[PDB]
């Protein structure tokens, strides 16, 4: 229940503001910057600010803080969801999120803000629906918003019915300094870019453990996602009733389902680091990377980031496979490898000097993270069974899907 949502700037200037209830004065935005500065300097800065009896909830955007001032005890989660929807709509309409587009599309930006929410209650949240009624280059509102199906616009015609799916896998491993993995969770991502004619109702079917157990086929390799979230077009009733993933696919790229469950398998890449750091004399980087993934899968664009000393200079890299580049801005050395086949063993030996004068304050030990991304690999083993594409007119669809395995929160605690 934010009183007014406004877009700020890096210098405190409000790029654009739009009051929705009028219960909060527009002059409260000026005091938001001093409050944020005081909070940052004291460690008490939070996204939800508080200016007396009015709370100024702000979200750190790409270039401006989306401050949504509120007065009463409005839904904080609702305000955050509205801000996220507004950010997504702006990203869809404008490819750049900065001051260049804030002051360049004000005529359409004001109309979009007015149409999105009224009296603090959001009304329009579909990017396609908003673009079909408000454009920067007006007819009556589309019937899709009024109709029940607000995620599948009717009347869409295409020459070919091709849908491109993406089995995105995020391998996150939380390995402590002792060598044991604490947080090892893999989050699935079933995103399909449906581009067909009409409003087909997708019938999602995969090798789900629950579905296999219900059907009596709980003996093969089935993916048991701890948390499964359906898309907006996905009908929750069918999933709760018999796990039937039946919903109208959206026009374009959208996230249908996103699995999320813990992983009990060995890490895809095993990286062991050795720190032979002398006392203000030199530093040793005994970094050894072992590929725990299958040899048939290659980790393309593998970049194992090893944090080097903050004051370290004149470093020498003695590795075997993969180029090592030291970035002064990042204050770390990334063991970048173009192609990392499974089972490969890469050994590196870093050596650099240190300044004679000791550092005044400590810099910490940031965890070492790798950027391995091996496509065409299904670590979870979940295989899609079928995709029920049904249309009233009747057409032969040719859906496609690709499985991509990447490294997410794969951070290894430093020694």
């Amino acid at each position: 229940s934010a009183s007014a949502v406004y877009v700020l700037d890096l210098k405190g200037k409000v790029l654009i503001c739009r009051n929705y209830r009028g219960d909060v004065d527009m002059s409260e935005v000026e005091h938001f910057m001093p409050i944020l500065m005081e909070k940052e300097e004291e460690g008490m800065l939070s996204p939800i600010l508080a200016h007396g009896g009015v709370r100024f909830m702000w979200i750190k955007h790409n270039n401006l803080y989306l401050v949504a001032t509120s007065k009463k005890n409005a839904c904080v989660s609702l305000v955050f969801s509205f801000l996220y929807k507004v950010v997504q709509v702006f990203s869809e309409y404008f490819k750049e999120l900065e001051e260049e587009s804030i002051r360049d599309n004000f005529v359409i930006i004001y109309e979009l803000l007015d149409e999105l929410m009224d009296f603090g209650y959001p009304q329009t949240t579909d990017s396609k629906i908003l673009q079909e009624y408000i454009t920067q280059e007006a007819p009556r509102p589309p019937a899709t918003v009024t109709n029940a199906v607000s995620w599948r616009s009717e009347g869409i015609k295409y020459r070919k019915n091709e849908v491109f799916l993406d089995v995105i896998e995020a391998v996150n491993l939380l390995v402590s300094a002792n060598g044991n993995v604490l947080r090892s969770e893999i989050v699935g991502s079933i995103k399909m870019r449906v581009f067909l004619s009409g409003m087909p109702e997708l019938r999602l079917g995969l090798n789900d453990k629950v579905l296999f157990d219900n059907t009596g086929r709980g003996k093969s390799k089935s993916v048991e996602l701890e948390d499964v979230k359906f898309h907006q077009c996905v009908r929750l009733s069918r999933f709760e009733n018999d796990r039937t993933i039946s919903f109208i696919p959206p026009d374009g790229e959208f996230e249908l389902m996103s699995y999320r469950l813990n992983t009990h398998v060995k890490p895809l890449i095993w990286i062991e680091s050795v720190i032979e750091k002398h006392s203000h004399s030199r530093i040793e980087y005994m970094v050894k990377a072992k590929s725990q993934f299958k040899r048939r899968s290659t980790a393309n664009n593998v970049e194992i980031h090893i944090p080097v000393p903050n004051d370290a200079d004149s470093p020498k890299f003695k590795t075997t496979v993969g180029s090592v580049k030291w970035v002064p801005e990042n204050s770390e050395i990334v063991w970048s490898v173009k192609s990392f086949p499974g089972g490969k063993e890469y050994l590196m030996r870093a050596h650099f000097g240190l300044p004679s004068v000791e550092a005044e304050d400590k810099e910490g030990k940031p965890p070492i993270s790798v950027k391995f991304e091996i496509p065409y690999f299904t670590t979870s083993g979940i295989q899609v069974r079928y995709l029920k594409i049904i249309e009233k007119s009747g057409y032969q669809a040719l859906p496609w899907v690709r499985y991509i395995t990447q490294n997410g929160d794969y951070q290894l605690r430093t020694q």
Partner: protein, 177 residues
């Protein structure tokens, strides 16, 4: 500057009026007190272009509290726009009527609110519910006298499920206060 903008707004050229409106909107967003030109834009308010109508409505909403006396020359325009065949125009008029913080403005908008309460368009119904909720928040006594509680309650048991949800949220907000 100000004189040139006023002269452009007091002209019969649609391109010049649109340029003046865009300049006024840019000045207002940049931090320029354009409330002094609100009476000049009052005459150039009833325009066929929807882009200019939205800018005029936004200027009136942002310049309603600053110049409540000058806002009395927009009740007729709001009444005329409340019966526009285009659902977008009707929704914009309903939103602007509830967004104007005028004590004497909402009194004359009760009839348009009652007319738009039974709007067949789900977007029109949602806009009418939002306007009723805004009027109740601004004046609970006025909302009670207009008898919008019965209309809001019956909106829940109708079609336009998004409009039903908007009406339910409006009723909860009215009951919350």
């Amino acid at each position: 500057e100000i004189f040139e903008l006023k002269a452009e707004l007091n002209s019969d050229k649609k391109e010049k009026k649109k340029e003046a409106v865009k300049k006024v909107i840019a000045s207002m967003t940049v931090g320029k007190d354009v409330s002094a030109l609100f009476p000049d834009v009052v005459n150039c308010m009833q325009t066929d272009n929807l882009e200019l109508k939205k800018l005029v409505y936004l200027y009136l909403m942002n310049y309603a509290k600053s110049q409540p006396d000058m806002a009395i020359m927009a009740v007729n325009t709001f009444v005329k726009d409340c019966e526009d065949p285009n659902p977008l125009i009707r929704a914009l008029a309903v939103r602007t009527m509830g967004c104007i913080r005028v004590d004497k403005i909402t009194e004359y908008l009760c009839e348009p609110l009652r007319k738009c309460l039974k709007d067949e368009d789900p977007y029109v119904r949602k806009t009418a519910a939002v306007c009723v909720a805004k009027l109740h928040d601004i004046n609970a006594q006025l909302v009670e006298d207009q008898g919008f509680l019965d209309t809001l309650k019956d909106l829940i048991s109708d079609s336009n499920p998004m409009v039903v949800a908007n009406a339910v949220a409006a009723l909860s907000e009215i009951a919350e206060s």
